[PDB]
Ligand binder design. Structure first.
Ligand SMILES: CN(C)c1ccc(O)c2c1C[C@H]1C[C@H]3[C@H](N(C)C)C(O)=C(C(N)=O)C(=O)[C@@]3(O)C(O)=C1C2=O
Ligand SMILES: CN(C)c1ccc(O)c2c1C[C@H]1C[C@H]3[C@H](N(C)C)C(O)=C(C(N)=O)C(=O)[C@@]3(O)C(O)=C1C2=O
Ligand SMILES: [Cl-]
Ligand SMILES: [Cl-]
Ligand SMILES: [Cl-]
Ligand SMILES: [Cl-]
Ligand SMILES: [Cl-]
Ligand SMILES: [Cl-]
Ligand SMILES: [Cl-]
Ligand SMILES: [Cl-]
Ligand SMILES: [Cl-]
Ligand SMILES: [Cl-]
Ligand SMILES: [Cl-]
Ligand SMILES: [Cl-]
Ligand SMILES: [Cl-]
Ligand SMILES: [Cl-]
Ligand SMILES: [Cl-]
Ligand SMILES: [Cl-]
Ligand SMILES: [Mg+2]
Ligand SMILES: [Mg+2]
Lengths: 199, 199
């Protein structure tokens, strides 16, 4: 079938949902596309190159809150941005593992730059803004990775542990994520407002 | 060579450092142990079973701050516990990926129970204590995963991005982790002390 970049991406994302990240192979992608492996190679050099592109395109397609609304507080931006990142990562099987290890692509530079500048315009030093943005990124990835990989992995319990596992087996991870996110953001705010004061 | 559980673990951890998680195979472990594959199978049924055991034994061996010191504040316990978890995860190649998706083993039940009880003794509801413990776990995993997988993965840059990448390429991830961790813990404290007050 059609082997423009868009269509190759499309097929690889469909395959990802079917196979997961470990099971995804270029041979299987060629099959899906109805082509021979050497044909695919002209378009897609290896699995690494494919995964890198998927990580970018999943966010381009589905991460809609990359930038602050006009007049938005930095707190609200980080909240909305994290929720959006989370959702985008969850949209595909093993989507957080596809993201893991990547760094901002040229196609995301202006976006990331804007996020950093926004933080510095709201009183963060570049370093402190970086630490905030990384912490949210790490927390969000971590939460989604554990959600997705725990699902992939699937009476002498002591009572709090039994109960805590009953709580966890009762939603998908969202409540715990959102509560953690609030804690994170509030801590960032306490730090920012402290300036040079012992806190 | 010797195929007691300890020695099999030992060899698998050595192999993990040599191959990484994706490259680790039972066939390669049998080679390392100087045995044939059917011999290994008696001891180790599959890679999953092996990884599960490694995740447990890495913490048993090297995560020394599972429990609060006598009289320790909950804040200090979470800090020390997170630092210890982080270090243990970093001790082996792809160590955070080995941990990912696991849940507490029978051999960790008393430990995890104690952590939960400790939080509830310090004023947390079980749910709020769970959310704190999960948030620290997720943040720590996320940070280490990104550190380890970014290393595994290894001029039109805009200036803040260029600068931020210079900052990141200057330590291993520790400074950003520790700063984030403080933000997280302080947010937990603001929440705990609020009780039923709008905050
Ligand atoms: C320079 N910049 C801080 C870095 C450095 C190394 C990194 O590994 C990363 C960044 C930017 C962050 C921005 C975060 C942002 N957010 C805090 C989740 C984000 O919304 C985006 C985005 N493209 O909209 C990211 O790329 C991002 O998810 C991401 O993957 C990043 C990331 O991987
Ligand atoms: C019931 N309990 C809260 C759960 C439920 C699901 C989970 O997936 C987990 C826990 C306990 C947490 C405790 C955390 C703890 N810490 C906050 C990092 C920890 O120190 C240990 C430990 N064994 O000392 C964990 O097992 C732990 O790393 C872990 O892997 C957990 C984990 O995987
Ligand atoms: Cl065709
Ligand atoms: Cl076609
Ligand atoms: Cl074509
Ligand atoms: Cl195209
Ligand atoms: Cl492949
Ligand atoms: Cl294949
Ligand atoms: Cl503020
Ligand atoms: Cl405070
Ligand atoms: Cl031998
Ligand atoms: Cl021997
Ligand atoms: Cl033996
Ligand atoms: Cl033994
Ligand atoms: Cl294997
Ligand atoms: Cl092999
Ligand atoms: Cl307190
Ligand atoms: Cl406050
Ligand atoms: Mg990223
Ligand atoms: Mg765990």
């Amino acid at each position: 079938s059609r082997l423009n970049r868009e269509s190759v991406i499309d097929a690889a994302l469909e395959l990802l949902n079917e196979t997961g990240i470990d099971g995804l192979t270029t041979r299987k992608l060629a099959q899906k596309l109805g082509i021979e492996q050497p044909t695919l190679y002209w378009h897609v050099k290896n699995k690494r190159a494919l995964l890198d592109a998927l990580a970018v395109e999943i966010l381009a397609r589905h991460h809609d809150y990359s930038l602050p609304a006009a007049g938005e507080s930095w707190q609200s931006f980080l909240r909305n941005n994290a929720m959006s990142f989370r959702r985008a990562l969850l949209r595909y099987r093993d989507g957080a593992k596809v993201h893991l290890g990547t760094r901002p692509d040229e196609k995301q530079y202006d976006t990331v730059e804007t996020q950093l500048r926004f933080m510095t315009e709201n009183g963060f030093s570049l370093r402190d803004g970086l630490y905030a943005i990384s912490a949210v990124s790490h927390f969000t990835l971590g939460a989604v990775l554990e959600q997705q990989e725990h699902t992939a992995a699937l009476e002498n319990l002591p009572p709090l542990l039994r109960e805590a596992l009953q709580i966890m087996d009762s939603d998908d991870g969202e409540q715990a994520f959102l509560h953690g996110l609030e804690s994170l953001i509030r801590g960032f705010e306490v730090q920012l407002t402290a300036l040079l004061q012992i806190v």
